[PDB]
């Protein structure tokens, strides 16, 4: 079992936090908020670095490029923005979604961005030109998450329509639809770090690990509360092999990936824990909470 202990609390956002992500190089934490801002923090000391501004409405998601040089953000202003983190410059504004942009990610080569929207589409954009390469008529309700697999040849999307879909990046073809024995909204999905599996959250208090090639649910993680919000979940890989998630009872939950047992709950937030992130090299978790709390917490384990 891990022994995550609170090390730092990061105050600065003026509304609900929406996402936290560690830079791949381990140096930084990026946060997005309903306050329309991105903040950068030191990953190891929690020290505030700077604010990246320009969205006109709240931000739902932010993601790093694989070389830690760029961020992409998804906003209710119906845009994504590509940011040079060192300069703070907005390199490109990606316009084309017809409603709120909810989710975003770079591909592994950080030459493409994928986005999902309340407009029920998935878009694929060229990083260097900022132009949209493809629009996928992916879902019949808002798209909650989008993620590329380990070589960028596939995208997984999740939706409030109750589906996860896997797309061919090059053709835009729908290769797979995954759904279990009930049809609750899907609030999050991502590929596993080696890409054998997907991890999906549904708004029935359930995380599931799927073998997407076989189309089978292999594991379920339960015990937390998740019926309303799009709560990210993580694979923790630096020490023990864990699943990490926020929860609507204001806790961070940590499960054993193999056994599905709860191994730790982290107490301290005063509102829903909307987002968690796992440091790429150190046993460090970042957690972030909604409007009644507005803080980020850094936790560290032996």
From Swiss-Prot:
Important for interaction with histone H3, annotated site positions: 76, 102, 232, 291
Gene that specifies this protein: Wdr5
Similarity comment: Belongs to the WD repeat WDR5/wds family.
Entry keyword annotation includes Phosphoprotein: no
Subcellular location: Nucleus
Pfam families: Beta-prop_WDR5 (PF25175)
Main location: nucleus
PANTHER family: WD REPEAT-CONTAINING PROTEIN 5 (PTHR22847:SF560), WD40 REPEAT PROTEIN (PTHR22847)
UniProt cross-references to Gene3D superfamilies, sorted A to Z: YVTN repeat-like/Quinoprotein amine dehydrogenase
Keyword check for Amino-acid biosynthesis: no
Protein name: WD repeat-containing protein 5
Tissues expressed in: Expressed in liver (at protein level). Detected in brain, testis and kidney.
Modification N6-acetyllysine, positions: 81
Sequence position, cross-link Glycyl lysine isopeptide (Lys-Gly) (interchain with G-Cter in SUMO2): 15
WD repeat extents: 12-51, 54-95, 97-137, 138-177, 181-222, 225-265, 268-302
UniProt keywords, alphabetically: Acetylation, Chromatin regulator, Isopeptide bond, Nucleus, Repeat, Transcription, Transcription regulation, Ubl conjugation, WD repeat
GO cellular component, one term: mitotic spindle
Complexes and interactors: Interacts with PAXBP1; the interaction is direct and links a WDR5-containing histone methyltransferase complex to PAX7 and PAX3. Interacts with HCFC1. Component of the ATAC complex, a complex with histone acetyltransferase activity on histones H3 and H4. Component of the SET1 complex, at least composed of the catalytic subunit (SETD1A or SETD1B), WDR5, WDR82, RBBP5, ASH2L/ASH2, CXXC1/CFP1, HCFC1 and DPY30. Core component of several methyltransferase-containing complexes including MLL1/MLL, MLL2/3 (also named ASCOM complex) and MLL4/WBP7.
One Gene Ontology term of the molecular function aspect: histone H3Q5ser reader activity
GO biological process, one term: transcription initiation-coupled chromatin remodeling
Role: Contributes to histone modification. May position the N-terminus of histone H3 for efficient trimethylation at 'Lys-4'. As part of the MLL1/MLL complex it is involved in methylation and dimethylation at 'Lys-4' of histone H3. H3 'Lys-4' methylation represents a specific tag for epigenetic transcriptional activation. As part of the NSL complex it may be involved in acetylation of nucleosomal histone H4 on several lysine residues. May regulate osteoblasts differentiation.
């Amino acid at each position: 079992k891990p022994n995550y202990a609170l090390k730092f609390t990061l105050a600065g956002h003026t509304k609900a936090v929406s996402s936290v992500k560690f830079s791949p190089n381990g140096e930084w934490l990026a946060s997005s908020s309903a306050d329309k801002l991105i903040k950068i923090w030191g990953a190891y000391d929690g020290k505030f670095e700077k604010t990246i501004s320009g969205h006109k409405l709240g931000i739902s998601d932010v993601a790093w490029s694989s070389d830690s040089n760029l961020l992409v953000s998804a906003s209710d202003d119906k845009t994504l923005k590509i940011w040079d983190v060192s300069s703070g410059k907005c390199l490109k504004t990606l316009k084309g979604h017809s409603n709120y942009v909810f989710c975003c990610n770079f591909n592994p080569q950080s030459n493409l961005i994928v986005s999902g929207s309340f407009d029920e589409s998935v878009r694929i954009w060229d990083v260097k030109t900022g132009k949209c390469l493809k629009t996928l008529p992916a879902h019949s309700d808002p798209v909650s998450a989008v993620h590329f697999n380990r070589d960028g040849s596939l995208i997984v999307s999740s939706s409030y329509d109750g589906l996860c879909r896997i797309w061919d990046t090059a053709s835009g073809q729908c290769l797979k639809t995954l759904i279990d024995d009930d049809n609750p909204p899907v609030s999050f999905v991502k590929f596993s770090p080696a890409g054998k599996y997907i991890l999906a959250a549904t708004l029935d208090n359930t995380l599931k690990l799927w073998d997407y090639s076989k189309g089978k649910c292999l594991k379920t993680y339960t015990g937390h509360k998740n019926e309303k919000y799009c709560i990210f979940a993580n694979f923790s890989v630096t020490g023990g092999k864990w699943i990490v998630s926020g929860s609507e009872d204001n806790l961070v939950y940590i499960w054993n990936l193999q056994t599905k047992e709860i191994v730790q709950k982290l107490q301290g937030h005063t509102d829903v824990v909307i987002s968690t992130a796992c440091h790429p090299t150190e046993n460090i978790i970042a957690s972030a909470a909604l409007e009644n709390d507005k803080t980020i917490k850094l936790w560290k384990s032996d």
